[PDB]
């Protein structure tokens, strides 16, 4: 708190917020997109609460393994750029539940996907972004939780009433560039502080705290030791944290849900000048989604080395006064490094750009949630839509969304042993693989009817929501005290459970679609993996996948070069791997 007290940086913060207010009022006073405002806008998603707090927190807790999620998201991003955007533009659709309405029968599929997308928004984006803003303001200005939260709500209300959302090309590419440059400068400051790179390797393994004895209660040595067998990427599949079969396959199906079916990610890239612009923006975003290993998980262990008392607490009586949480709290690994290892000319710039990249990721999700609600549920129940009532029920809906999202926070800040990445993935894994399985079998197999996909979705929800309710009513617990759950559904792992739920939902929907009636081919022509040119009946911008044959060639060589560089980083960080002695 003392570090940001100085007036010198406050000038940088206020002129940055005045700059974004000026470009918002310029947007209010003044779909043909270029590849660079597509790549930065795809890269800046899940930044601020899944790239700074949770990713660096799990890196300070475990090590280098959580960086592989970044390369899994890279590969699924390129799969989105190749495959799913031509499918979304061939059928002439703008999102996933409208596609399923133009693929399946009546309204129940669309309203169930709307309810599920709203609950996934509340559980994984709005609450996590509000909690990450609360961590930022609590570790910067020393206040409590609720006052920091309502300051964040006030400044994001000013940001969305200014009108920065309408010019989200320039503001997001500027915030992405400034944030990436500042994080590179902070990584160069961080590796200069610990003394190179070998001292970073050796000093991290002996980075225990010093308050390990709480009088009568004394914790085991495995709680505060930094997992001394774990510095390498691919852990043990059975009893290792983030196991390597489960890592690749569970993060593949989770990033296939997130990077292909989310209502704002594809709409962000559907509005573009050409298909080659979309593929070039996806390759640029794939290049930018390669850095967070060297950018945001290596400083996580730097903050374990430098301050091994606020990042690696074990004892709750003093851990509640340092970070505000009863157990572990590794979430503050990255903001403690920003407010301590920066000069005064950039420490304001970093806390300004890591709040601009959060206010944008809140004002996108609030507008998308209001659109989904008042265009897919309230317009289907009332079916009259007096427009003043529509506007006031949208405003009352987003106020209700804030009201529930604030109250969800004390589950988030102590949900999964302190971490935040292990909450986002643990909530996405219980509700995303049914949607991913139903989407995949709706595209590729083509003998699927509406009675099969809906009941597969409902059985996947009845298993995953049961696991979610049984988990959060009990919890993982501390190292010393094991969880009191029925272990056969509680404690396998939440990635193994994601693969099991994906396979179970796929088998259930293919069984129910093979029992009942099929779907006639005569009105499934453009969509569902077919290139015919005959009409259909069911239920300028781009309306093509075409480009020049030279540009298709250079895009294919750039994509195979990006896969070559990604598999080079994979094959480097898996080949060399340090093992410790007895």
């Amino acid at each position, epitope marked *: 708190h003392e570090l940001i007290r100085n007036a010198a940086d406050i000038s940088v913060i206020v002129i940055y917020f005045l700059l974004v207010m000026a470009v918002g009022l310029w947007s209010m006073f003044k779909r043909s997109m270029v590849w660079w405002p597509i790549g930065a806008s795809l890269f800046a998603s899940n930044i601020g609460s899944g790239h700074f707090i949770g990713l660096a927190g799990t890196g300070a807790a475990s090590g280098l393994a959580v960086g592989g999620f970044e390369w899994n998201a890279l590969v699924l991003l390129l799969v989105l750029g190749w495959v799913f955007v031509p499918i979304y533009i061939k059928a002439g659709v703008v999102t996933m539940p409208e596609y399923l309405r133009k693929r399946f029968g009546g309204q129940r599929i669309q309203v169930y996907l709307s309810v599920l997308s709203l609950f996934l928004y509340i559980f994984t984006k709005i609450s996590v972004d509000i909690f990450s803003g609360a961590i930022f303001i609590n570790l910067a200005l020393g206040w409590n939780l609720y006052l920091s939260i309502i300051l964040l709500l006030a400044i994001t209300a000013l940001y969305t009433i200014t009108g920065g959302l309408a010019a989200v090309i320039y503001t997001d590419t500027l915030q992405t560039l400034i944030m990436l440059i500042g994080a590179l400068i902070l990584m160069g400051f961080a590796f200069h502080e610990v003394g190179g790179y070998d001292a970073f*390797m050796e000093k991290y393994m002996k980075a225990i705290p010093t308050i390990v004895s709480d009088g009568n209660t004394t914790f085991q040595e495995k709680c505060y030791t930094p997992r001394a067998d774990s510095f390498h990427i691919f852990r043990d599949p059975l009893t290792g944290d983030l196991p390597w079969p489960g890592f690749i396959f569970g993060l593949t199906i989770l990033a296939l849900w997130y990077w292909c079916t989310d209502q704002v990610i594809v709409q962000r890239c559907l509005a573009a000048k050409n298909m080659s612009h979309v593929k070039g923006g996806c390759i640029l975003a794939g290049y930018l989604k390669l850095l967070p290993m060297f950018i945001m998980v290596m400083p996580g262990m730097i903050s374990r080395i430098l301050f091994p008392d606020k990042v690696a607490c074990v004892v709750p009586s003093e851990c509640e006064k340092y970070c505000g949480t009863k157990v572990g709290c590794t979430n503050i690994a990255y903001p403690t490094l920003v407010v301590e290892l920066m000069p005064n000319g950039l420490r304001g710039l970093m806390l300004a750009v890591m709040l601009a990249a959060l206010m944008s990721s809140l004002t996108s999700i609030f507008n998308s949630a209001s659109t989904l609600f008042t265009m897919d549920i309230y317009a289907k129940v009332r079916k009259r839509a007096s427009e003043k009532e529509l506007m006031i029920v949208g405003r009352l809906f987003v106020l209700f969304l804030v009201v529930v999202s604030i109250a969800w926070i004390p589950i988030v800040q102590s949900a999964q042993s302190g971490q935040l990445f292990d909450y986002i993935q643990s909530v996405s894994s219980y509700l995303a693989p049914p949607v991913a399985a139903v989407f995949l079998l709706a595209i590729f197999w083509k003998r699927v009817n509406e009675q099969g996909a809906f009941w597969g979705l409902i059985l996947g929800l009845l298993l995953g929501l049961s696991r979610l309710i049984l988990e959060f009513a009990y919890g993982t617990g501390s190292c010393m005290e094991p969880s009191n759950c029925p272990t056969i559904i509680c404690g396998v792992h939440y990635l193994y459970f994601a693969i099991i739920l994906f396979a179970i939902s796929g088998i259930v929907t293919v069984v129910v679609s093979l029992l009942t009636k099929p779907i006639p081919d005569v009105h499934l022509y453009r969509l569902c993996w077919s290139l015919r040119n005959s009409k259909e009946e069911r239920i300028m911008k781009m309306t093509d996948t075409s480009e020049k044959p030279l540009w298709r060639t250079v895009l294919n060589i750039n994509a195979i070069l990006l896969l070559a560089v990604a598999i080079f980083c994979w094959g480097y960080f898996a080949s060399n791997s340090l093992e410790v002695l007895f």
Partner: nanobody
Amino acid sequence: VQLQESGGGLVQAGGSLRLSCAASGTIFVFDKMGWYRQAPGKEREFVATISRGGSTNYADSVKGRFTISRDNAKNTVYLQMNSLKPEDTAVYYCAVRYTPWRRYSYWGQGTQVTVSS
């Protein structure tokens, strides 16, 4: 963090000495603790890079007559050289690697062996 070494000294031709290099202060198990000699007026030339699994790789001049074996769980390399000939009058450093793509992070101080005839 430091490579303590000993064993070097003076002996006549045809003799045999054992060179030791016991690391300390580290937590990891080192990979390629191979010796590197240096003749006066010459560079560092020969490799003896025993791996983590254990696989010697000599220079052809010292091949066969020189042997090397480390205990694979206690991080101490022992170079046992035999049939000393008067071209080996050189200082003999130690040299280690963390990993097979790091290229010799640490280094040794220097152990000089002088053989006479």
